[PDB]
Amino acid sequence: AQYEDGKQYTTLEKPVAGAPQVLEFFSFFCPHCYQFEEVLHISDNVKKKLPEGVKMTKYHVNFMGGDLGKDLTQAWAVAMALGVEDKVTVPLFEGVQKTQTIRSASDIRDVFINAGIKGEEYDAAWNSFVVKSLVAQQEKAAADVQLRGVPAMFVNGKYQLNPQGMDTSNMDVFVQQYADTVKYLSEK
Amino acid sequence: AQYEDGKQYTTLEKPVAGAPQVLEFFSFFCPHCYQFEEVLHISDNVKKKLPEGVKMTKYHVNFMGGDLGKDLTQAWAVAMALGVEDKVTVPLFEGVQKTQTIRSASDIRDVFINAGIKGEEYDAAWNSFVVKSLVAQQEKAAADVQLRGVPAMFVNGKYQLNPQGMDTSNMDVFVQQYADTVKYLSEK
Numbered sequence: 032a033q034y035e036d037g038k039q040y041t042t043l044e045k046p047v048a049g050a051p052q053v054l055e056f057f058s059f060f061c062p063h064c065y066q067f068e069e070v071l072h073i074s075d076n077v078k079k080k081l082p083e084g085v086k087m088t089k090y091h092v093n094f095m096g097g098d099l100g101k102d103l104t105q106a107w108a109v110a111m112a113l114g115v116e117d118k119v120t121v122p123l124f125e126g127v128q129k130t131q132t133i134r135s136a137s138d139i140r141d142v143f144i145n146a147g148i149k150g151e152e153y154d155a156a157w158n159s160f161v162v163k164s165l166v167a168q169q170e171k172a173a174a175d176v177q178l179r180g181v182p183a184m185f186v187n188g189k190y191q192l193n194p195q196g197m198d199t200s201n202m203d204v205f206v207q208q209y210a211d212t213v214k215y216l217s218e219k
Numbered sequence: 220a221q222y223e224d225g226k227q228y229t230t231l232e233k234p235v236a237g238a239p240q241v242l243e244f245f246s247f248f249c250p251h252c253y254q255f256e257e258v259l260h261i262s263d264n265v266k267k268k269l270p271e272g273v274k275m276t277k278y279h280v281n282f283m284g285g286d287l288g289k290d291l292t293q294a295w296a297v298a299m300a301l302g303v304e305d306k307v308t309v310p311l312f313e314g315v316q317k318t319q320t321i322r323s324a325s326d327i328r329d330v331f332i333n334a335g336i337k338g339e340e341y342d343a344a345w346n347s348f349v350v351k352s353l354v355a356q357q358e359k360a361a362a363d364v365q366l367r368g369v370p371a372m373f374v375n376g377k378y379q380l381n382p383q384g385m386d387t388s389n390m391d392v393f394v395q396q397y398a399d400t401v402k403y404l405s406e407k
């Protein structure tokens with residue numbers, strides 16, 4: 032791999048200060064986001080190659096979800112607040128897109144309860160100031176990088192991953208090129 | 220429901236003569252269209268609510284996806300001509316938006332093959348004047364209603380569905396309101 036601005040990544044005209052080191056955006060409605068997370072395991076594969084100390088951040092957005100989309104963003108805030116992202120990401124993606132068992136906020140709550148989060152705890156977090164702030168943070172971060180679509184990933188508020196210019200003849204190779212690019216950018 | 224023009228539906232300025240009773244437009248590149256098919260099953264649920272004998276028509280549009288977009292419109296003509304819409308809708312949607320493995324006309328052809336359509340039969344259809352006419356029909360129909368985006372549904376060439384004005388907190392409530400609006404308009 033030979034890295035060039037415009038090839039594996041692009042450079043934001045307006046860099047974001049104080050941005051997370053590695054910031055990924057997604058939506059539980061987004062088919063290619065399902066592909067990224069549930070099939071390719073982009074987040075996990077990127078994390079595996081990240082330099083020690085560099086943490087990953089993942090935010091939910093709402094391009095095609097209406098009110099339910101907003102519920103999902105707030106629920107993702109709850110997942111972050113409780114630190115249970117690795118417990119609810121799979122049943123949320125599956126429930127929305129595959130089994131079609133997630134149709135409302137109540138169904139989202141049921142997913143957390145089934146994953147081991149007590150209903151009272153979910154509700155406390157849901158109505159918490161921490162989650163209210165996390166919802167605002169997700170929205171602001173999207174605005175800051177002038178987010179146009181998902182999935183997307185940004186490194187140090189400066190660089191935007193560009194998977195269009197990566198090898199896709201093989202999904203295993205794509206994942207490695209993608210993850211290697213994040214590693215490279217994080218080291219810049 | 221209190222139906223109001225501008226809320227659940229809009230009224231075309233110049234209604235289309237001889238227009239299909241129920242006419243849907245979509246694109247395989249269209250994210251809400253993907254949702255309308257896989258998660259909400261709008262067409263199925265509208266059909267269920269309408270009387271037996273109301274014709275539903277669904278056309279593909281050109282203005283998403285560049286050259287592959289035109290190819291998909293021709294491919295949808297093939298599907299209509301062969302009567303295999305239900306065999307190819309999901310793998311076309313997922314090939315375009317989920318796995319992104321549909322990149323050329325050849326990839327579209329592969330989907331039809333894998334869905335059981337004999338290759339020689341696809342090719343004969345692809346190059347047929349019956350299909351050429353169906354492509355023209357889809358384009359003319361969109362032009363007749365001055366189509367600006369997808370998804371879109373028109374009733375009796377008079378009214379256009381307005382999902383933006385509907386409740387989006389619960390998927391099944393949205394589908395119910397959508398289908399109920401179509402029935403209301405059909406009886407107007």
Ligand SMILES: Cc1nc(-c2ccc(C(F)(F)F)cc2)sc1C(=O)O
Nearest residue numbers: 096097099251382383387389390393
């Ligand atoms: C076509 C469309 N469709 C929308 C939608 C449909 C269903 C739902 C939910 F299922 F979540 F209820 C949300 C948004 S918004 C929308 C638009 O063009 O504004």
